[PDB]
Amino acid sequence: SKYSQDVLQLLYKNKPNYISGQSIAESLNISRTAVKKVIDQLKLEGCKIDSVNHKGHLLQQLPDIWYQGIIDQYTKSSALFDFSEVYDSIDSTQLAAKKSLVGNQSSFFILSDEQTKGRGRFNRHWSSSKGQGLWMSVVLRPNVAFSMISKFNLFIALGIRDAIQHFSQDEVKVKWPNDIYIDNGKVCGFLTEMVANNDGIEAIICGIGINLTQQLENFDESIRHRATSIQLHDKNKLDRYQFLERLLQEIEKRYNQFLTLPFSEIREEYIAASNIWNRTLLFTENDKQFKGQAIDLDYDGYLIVRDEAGESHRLISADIDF
Amino acid sequence: SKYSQDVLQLLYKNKPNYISGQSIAESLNISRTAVKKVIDQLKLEGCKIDSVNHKGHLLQQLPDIWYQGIIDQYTKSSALFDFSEVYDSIDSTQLAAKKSLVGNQSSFFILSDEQTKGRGRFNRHWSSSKGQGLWMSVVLRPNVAFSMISKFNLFIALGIRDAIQHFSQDEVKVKWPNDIYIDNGKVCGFLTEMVANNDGIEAIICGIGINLTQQLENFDESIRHRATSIQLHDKNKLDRYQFLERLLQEIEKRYNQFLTLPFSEIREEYIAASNIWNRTLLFTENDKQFKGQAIDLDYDGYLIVRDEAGESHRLISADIDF
Ligand SMILES: O=C(O)CCCC[C@@H]1SC[C@@H]2NC(=O)N[C@@H]21
Ligand SMILES: O=C(O)CCCC[C@@H]1SC[C@@H]2NC(=O)N[C@@H]21
């Protein structure tokens, strides 16, 4: 409805306290009896609101839907993001982001419940079902030379890992350069792209897909043995609005780190985090395909690999399989 | 009008021959007497059409307006470009291009008679008056690593130079890395940007502004001593549709060269072309500003400079003043 969001906003801003139909009706400037329709609807949409007589309304729990109104609260308190955009379904949050960044310098992010044409690295299909995962592109505006994309990718990786870790009983590791794993289920994939030129970057557009609320039965086939959600490694229910909040919090931390520190400082931690050593790796390079071993990550973000034929390579990027 | 373009198309396709109101009327499937309005209008818009009784209509000369219909002919015969877009006025042909490239792989270009918000390097204002200059962004899809932007810039430079040269009595030189000069008037500036990621470029978007039909009196102030048009170095009238045709022809040649040759091969020619040696240069780098001498362009597109304090720099890019 026309007013739904503003209602949800007031409801949210007012926790841990109740507020009266009355009090809402004065703010939004609409009938006491319209606020009831709006509420009776929000509940029907799966909202948990406690309504008690004489006292009013308290927002208890939100469903697995993103609401522009409440996501406005995050953008508001943010010291990073100007605005956000929220859709229930779009073609792709990266495509949207790439459109929205032109002729302005805003930092911002875009969430969508469902993607109908979401892609990953190399333009692989990316599965993005309604109400199941956080599908989001983020735009930032670092003031750096274009060479520095690679580092961003590494820092953010730890942001996305921690955010996810704080919610997982099992250990969450990073599979360089782009994937986040819990055990041998890929929980999230992310991708960093830039608009840039000869001297200075115009924007960064990091697209992030994390699987939130998936049962084993939801995946297939046969990805079911190398894909896992967050929920499947957390005894208690996973709150999408709570995860968002830490994810954004960590994305920020790691952005600033990126902005003020050379990699070396992060390096040793990134190692503790990676699950690529002491196992055979499966590298692809256009027509060519080979095996090899991850030996080390050097100070510049590059991966030092020993291919099965004994030769040493120093790689900026790669796509790797277990 | 609704049909104007299709008329102009037939008119153009039929040179050096006349064609009858009749013959047009059958193709476009409209009254013989509507074709007359369309023609009487095209003339009034500054078209030169010869109409003789019993014989018909011949397209003699086009004004200083771009027409989507005739520009369709170039895109059609092209072995490079899928389509084009033509506007009489837009915000910026780069902005437009950056929007139009998303979620597709088309190669294409965009022309506009006037820009209301056209920018150059570092987001400097770029003057783009109606009917006076070729204002165009071009999109290509090379299949190369993102590092290779720099080279593209160098090759295209010679394309844009030759295209312009064939029309100038005075010698046309390239001021590395982005400007085209005739004597000490900047005739054109161009800029190469990319959308790309860790492994592979998504698109190139080279934006090109060349001054076509400017009198000294049109410029100011006081750019009038370091800016010059093409027309001011050509005794005979400059045809915007004829220049476009060679420009596109050269852009293509030089693109293919880029695609199949290392720089070294172009290098020595690029030198004959540059007007940066044996004079003092004025380099800017963020807060810092210094003098120096252009000593050489090495095989990798980099400029070897000797700053006034005797130190040697190897530069990928720079902004330079005379
Ligand atoms: O291929 C991968 O390794 C990761 C793909 C990352 C996809 C995310 S989902 C949200 C955003 N929208 C997209 O189109 N892609 C990113
Ligand atoms: O600053 C320079 O040195 C050159 C500027 C190049 C501007 C051209 S004009 C057509 C296209 N549209 C733009 O916004 N810029 C390029």
Contacts of B56 (CB under 8 A, 6+ apart): B18, B19, B20, B21, B22, B23
Q: Do A45 and A37 meet the contact criterion of CB atoms below 8 Å apart?
A: no
Q: Do A233 and A169 meet the contact criterion of CB atoms below 8 Å apart?
A: yes
Token reading at A5: 């969001």
Residue A202: name the closest of B98, B311, B96, B162 by CA. Answer: B98
Verify whether the Cβ–Cβ distance A193 to B192 is below 8 Å: no
B286: domain CATH number is 2.30.30.100
Ligand 1 pocket residue status of A219, Cβ below 6 Å: no
Residue A135: name the closest of A98, A167, A100, A87 by CA. Answer: A87
* Atom 10 of ligand 2, nearest CA residue: B135
Which residue out of A137, A191, A198 would a mutagenesis test of the B interface target, given it has the greatest number of B Cβ atoms within 10 Å? Answer: A198
With CA atoms as reference, the chain A residue closest to B117 would be: A103
Give ∠ CA B204-B205-B207 in degrees, rounded to 5: 145
Using the Cα atoms of residue B134, residue B137, residue B143 and residue B145 in order, give the sign of their dihedral.
positive
Token reading at A239: 């709150």
Contacts of A262 (CB under 8 A, 6+ apart): A299
Residue B267: name the closest of B154, B147, B172 by CA. Answer: B154
Task: Break chain B down into helix, strand, coil percent, rounded to 5.
Answer: 35, 30, 35
Q: What is the DSSP letter of A277?
A: B
Atom index in ligand 2 nearest the CA of residue B188 equals 4
Write the residue in B102, B121, B191 that is nearest to A98 by C-beta. Answer: B102
* Atom 10 of ligand 1, nearest CA residue: A135
Give ∠ CA B209-B117-B70 in degrees, rounded to 5: 50
Ligand 2 pocket residue status of B263, Cβ below 6 Å: no
Q: What is the DSSP letter of B213?
A: S
Label residues B197-231 b or e (16+ Cβ within 10 Å = b): bbbbbbbbbbbbbbbbbbeeeebeeeeeeebbbbb
Contacts 24+ apart (CB under 8 A), B47-53: B47/B8, B49/B11, B50/B18, B52/B18
Verify whether the Cβ–Cβ distance B193 to A194 is below 8 Å: no
With CA atoms as reference, the chain B residue closest to A150 would be: B198
| CA B1 to the chain's CA centroid | 28
Same domain flag for A119 and A262: yes
Residue length of chain A: 322
Residue B196: name the closest of B121, B110, B101 by CA. Answer: B101
Q: How many domains does chain A have?
A: 3
The alpha carbon of B135 and the centre of ligand 2 are apart by a number of angstroms equal to 7
Distances (CA, A) of A109 to A95, A207, B222: 12, 9, 43
Q: What is the DSSP letter of B171?
A: P
Using the Cα atoms of residue B22, residue B24, residue B30 and residue B32 in order, give the sign of their dihedral.
negative
AA identity, residue B265:
E
Q: Measured between alpha carbons, how far apart are the two ends of chain B, in Å?
A: 48
Distances (CA, A) of B45 to A127, B4, B114: 54, 11, 17
| CA A247 to the chain's CA centroid | 7
Q: How big is chain B by its Cα radius of gyration, in Å?
A: 22
Q: Which of B35, B63, B91 is the last residue of a domain?
A: B63
Token reading at A74: 């995050």
Contacts 24+ apart (CB under 8 A), A224-229: A225/A184, A226/A184, A226/A185, A226/A186, A226/A322, A227/A185, A227/A186, A228/A182, A228/A183, A228/A185, A228/A186, A228/A187, A229/A132, A229/A133, A229/A185, A229/A187
The alpha carbon of A78 and the centre of ligand 1 are apart by a number of angstroms equal to 24
Verify whether the Cβ–Cβ distance A197 to B149 is below 8 Å: yes
Distances (CA, A) of A293 to A179, A305, A319, B259: 18, 6, 13, 33
Token reading at A76: 């508001």
B118 by DSSP, 3-state: which?
Answer: coil
Q: Measured between alpha carbons, how far apart are the two ends of chain A, in Å?
A: 48
Beta strand spans in A17-168 (E): 48-52, 56-61, 83-87, 108-112, 133-140
Ligand 2 pocket residue status of B192, Cβ below 6 Å: no
Token reading at A140: 């930032």
Question: Which H or E element spans position A158?
Answer: helix A149-165
- Please give the full DSSP string across A230-259, using - where no structure is assigned: SGGG-SSPP-HHHHHHHHHHHHHHHHHHHH
With CA atoms as reference, the chain B residue closest to A319 would be: B199
Atom index in ligand 1 nearest the CA of residue A95 equals 14
For A105-134, give the secondary structure using H, E and C: CCCEEEEECCECCCECHHHCECCCCCCCEE
Distance in angstroms (rounded) separating the CA atoms of residues A68 and B166: 57
Q: Which residue has the tokens 């990718």?
A: A153
Q: How big is chain A by its Cα radius of gyration, in Å?
A: 22
Residue A199: name the closest of B281, B156, B188, B284 by CA. Answer: B284
Question: Which H or E element spans position A283?
Answer: strand A280-285
Phi, psi of B177 (to 5 degrees): -100, 5
Contacts of A149 (CB under 8 A, 6+ apart): A192, A194, A196, A201, A204, B197, B198
Distance in angstroms (rounded) separating the CA atoms of residues B178 and B195: 19
B39: domain CATH number is 1.10.10.10
Distance in angstroms (rounded) separating the CA atoms of residues A251 and A242: 14
Distance in angstroms (rounded) separating the CA atoms of residues B69 and B77: 13
Q: What is the DSSP letter of A223?
A: G
Distance in angstroms (rounded) separating the CA atoms of residues A142 and A194: 11
B111 by DSSP, 3-state: which?
Answer: strand
B81 by DSSP, 3-state: which?
Answer: coil
- Please give the full DSSP string across B3-69, using - where no structure is assigned: SHHHHHHHHHHTTTS-B-HHHHIIIII--HHHHHHHHHHHHHTT-EEEEETTTEEEEEE--SS--HH
Residue B199: name the closest of A87, A178, A174 by CA. Answer: A178
Token reading at B12: 């153009």
Same domain flag for B51 and B94: no
Distance in angstroms (rounded) separating the CA atoms of residues B95 and B51: 41
Phi, psi of A37 (to 5 degrees): -60, -45
Q: Which of B40, B63, B86 is the last residue of a domain?
A: B63
Strand A133-140, strand A172-175: pairing: unpaired
DSSP lists the bridge partners of residue B84 as B109
Distance in angstroms (rounded) separating the CA atoms of residues A57 and A39: 9
Verify whether the Cβ–Cβ distance B149 to A193 is below 8 Å: no
AA identity, residue A249:
Q
Helix, strand counts (H, E) of chain A: 8, 13
Question: Which H or E element spans position B178?
Answer: none
B23: exposed, middle or buried (Cβ count in 10 Å: 0-12, 13-18, 19+)? middle
Verify whether the Cβ–Cβ distance A103 to B91 is below 8 Å: yes
What phi-psi label fits residue A123: left (phi over 0), alpha (psi between -120 and 50 degrees) or beta?
A: left
Same domain flag for A74 and A217: yes
Q: Do A88 and A112 meet the contact criterion of CB atoms below 8 Å apart?
A: yes
Q: Do A97 and A122 meet the contact criterion of CB atoms below 8 Å apart?
A: no
Rounded to a whole number of angstroms, the distance from the CA of A31 to the nearest CA of chain B is 43
Is A100 in the B-facing interface, judged by CB distances under 8 Å?
no
AA identity, residue B85:
E
Token reading at B246: 């060679």
Distance in angstroms (rounded) separating the CA atoms of residues A167 and B154: 51
* In chain B, residues 168-227 whose CB comes closer than 8 Å to chain A: 177, 191-200, 202
Q: Do B230 and B168 meet the contact criterion of CB atoms below 8 Å apart?
A: yes
Ligand 2 pocket residue status of B253, Cβ below 6 Å: no
Cis peptide leading into residue B221 (ω within 30°): yes
DSSP lists the bridge partners of residue B310 as none
B108 by DSSP, 3-state: which?
Answer: strand
- Please give the full DSSP string across A181-196, using - where no structure is assigned: EETTEEEEEEEEEEEE
Same domain flag for A316 and A228: no
Q: Do A320 and A289 meet the contact criterion of CB atoms below 8 Å apart?
A: no
Q: Which of B256, B275, B294 is the last residue of a domain?
A: B275
Same domain flag for B287 and B239: no
Same domain flag for A189 and A222: yes
Rounded to a whole number of angstroms, the distance from the CA of A37 to the nearest CA of chain B is 41
Write the residue in B98, B202, B319 that is nearest to A102 by C-beta. Answer: B98
Q: What is the dihedral of CA B238, B240, B244, B245, to 10 degrees?
A: -70
Contacts of B115 (CB under 8 A, 6+ apart): B89, B90, B91, B92, B93, B126, B128, B135
Contacts 24+ apart (CB under 8 A), B17-26: B17/B58, B18/B50, B18/B52, B18/B55, B18/B56, B18/B57, B18/B58, B19/B56, B19/B57, B19/B58, B20/B55, B20/B56, B20/B57, B21/B56, B21/B57, B22/B56, B23/B56, B24/B57
Same domain flag for A253 and A171: yes
The alpha carbon of A204 and the centre of ligand 2 are apart by a number of angstroms equal to 22
Using the Cα atoms of residue B215, residue B219, residue B224 and residue B229 in order, give the sign of their dihedral.
negative
Verify whether the Cβ–Cβ distance B95 to A103 is below 8 Å: yes
AA identity, residue B173:
K
CB atoms within 10 A of CB A154: 20
Same domain flag for B246 and B170: yes
A200 by DSSP, 3-state: which?
Answer: coil
Q: What is the DSSP letter of A222?
A: S
A71 by DSSP, 3-state: which?
Answer: helix
Same domain flag for B246 and B159: yes
Distance in angstroms (rounded) separating the CA atoms of residues B231 and B132: 10
Same domain flag for A76 and A202: yes
- Please give the full DSSP string across B264-321, using - where no structure is assigned: HHHHHHHHHHB--BTSEEEEEETTEEEEEEEEEE-TTS-EEEEETTS-EEEES--B--
A153: domain CATH number is 3.30.930.10
Name chain A contacts of B191, Cβ cutoff 8 Å. 197
Same domain flag for A262 and A291: no
Q: Which residue has the tokens 């006076």?
A: B132
Q: What is the dihedral of CA B116, B122, B124, B128, to 10 degrees?
A: -40
Q: Which residue has the tokens 């420009």?
A: B247
Distances (CA, A) of A152 to A11, A78, A194, B314: 37, 20, 11, 26
Rounded to a whole number of angstroms, the distance from the CA of A234 to the nearest CA of chain B is 33
Contacts of B161 (CB under 8 A, 6+ apart): B172, B173, B174, B180, B273
Q: Do A164 and A208 meet the contact criterion of CB atoms below 8 Å apart?
A: no
| CA B161 to the chain's CA centroid | 10
Q: Domain range spanning residue B167? A: 64-275
**According to the entry, how was the structure determined?**
X-ray
Same domain flag for A232 and A290: no
